[PDB]
Amino acid sequence: TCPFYKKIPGTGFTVDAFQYGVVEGCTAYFLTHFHSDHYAGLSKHFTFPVYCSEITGNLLKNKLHVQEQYIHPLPLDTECIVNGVKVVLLDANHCPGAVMILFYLPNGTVILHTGDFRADPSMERSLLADQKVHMLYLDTTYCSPEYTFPSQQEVIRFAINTAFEAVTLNPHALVVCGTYSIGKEKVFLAIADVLGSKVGMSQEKYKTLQCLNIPEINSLITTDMCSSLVHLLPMMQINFKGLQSHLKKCGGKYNQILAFRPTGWTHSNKFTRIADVIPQTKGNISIYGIPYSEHSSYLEMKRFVQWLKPQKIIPTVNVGTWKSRSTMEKYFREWKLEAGY
Ligand code: NI
């Protein structure tokens, strides 16, 4: 049974509610982005309308084999009508194709569902600037002040320099990058670009990246591992055992692996600067955990909410425990008192 924070009152609409079978009353199913906690239950057998971005649509079609007829892509930044209700899709600054959704209810209420986002001050000059929002359905993944992490630009700088230095000292080193979903592509793309290589990967992953409308992508990726010195692998394989095994496969082309695990937050953030980050090493293999986040930091979140001044906030993450809910409502009250709304 579908929970309440996935339902849009005064509409026949749900958001990211595909694991509950047929939801009573739902005339249109919205999908914010192509991550499996959110698309859970879609398949080639789904026959209700799905509304999403063009990219999320390429993925539903090609990866999950949803039929063309049930896929309704919408352009971003554009007023559209769906079963008599005005909507707009906005970029969420999460993974490719990820959107926020503005609903303009027939009674005059205005609702913002952020799906998954990384709040940014550029969002303050979207179509959000031009009117009030009564309810906000907020991604609260890191809604606690201990969640700090650097900018995406800083982390990429750190990775670029790390990889370039290591491979200039040892031309026979291989760089490996872990992945388990879409998102965070900039990590492996930035590294390959500085080394003048394409990124090599499995057929299943090449296919996924082929759906993403990335400019010049045929220039940047490939399925021929041998021609490439940046390889992608499943995140699970990013460990001393997994990498030793992979290295055996490359046929004495390489004598060293430098690998990167993009994580979200990790408690090493509570002590370390991105500049001071050190790998875990065993022999000819080093592994860096880098805090590349696609979710708001606590401060990025707080800033966006104090700017938007919503009348009511409904959290969509960390809702399962009384301690989490209580913690979050305290922070919402603080922000409101501090800013005067
Ligand atoms: Ni997500």
Curated annotation (Swiss-Prot):
Induction: During mitosis. The mRNA encoding this protein contains an internal ribosome entry site (IRES) in its 5'-UTR. This 5'-UTR generally suppresses translation while specifically promoting expression during mitosis, when cap-dependent translation may be impaired. It comes from the Eukaryota. It is found in: Nucleus. Expressed in brain, heart, kidney, liver, pancreas, placenta and skeletal muscle. Belongs to the DNA repair metallo-beta-lactamase (DRMBL) family. May be required for DNA interstrand cross-link repair. Also required for checkpoint mediated cell cycle arrest in early prophase in response to mitotic spindle poisons. Possesses beta-lactamase activity, catalyzing the hydrolysis of penicillin G and nitrocefin. Exhibits no activity towards other beta-lactam antibiotic classes including cephalosporins (cefotaxime) and carbapenems (imipenem). Binds constitutively to TP53BP1. Binds CDC27, which is itself a component of the anaphase promoting complex (APC). Binds PIAS1. This is DNA cross-link repair 1A protein. It comes from Homo sapiens (Human). The chain holds residues 700 to 1040 of 1040 of the full protein.
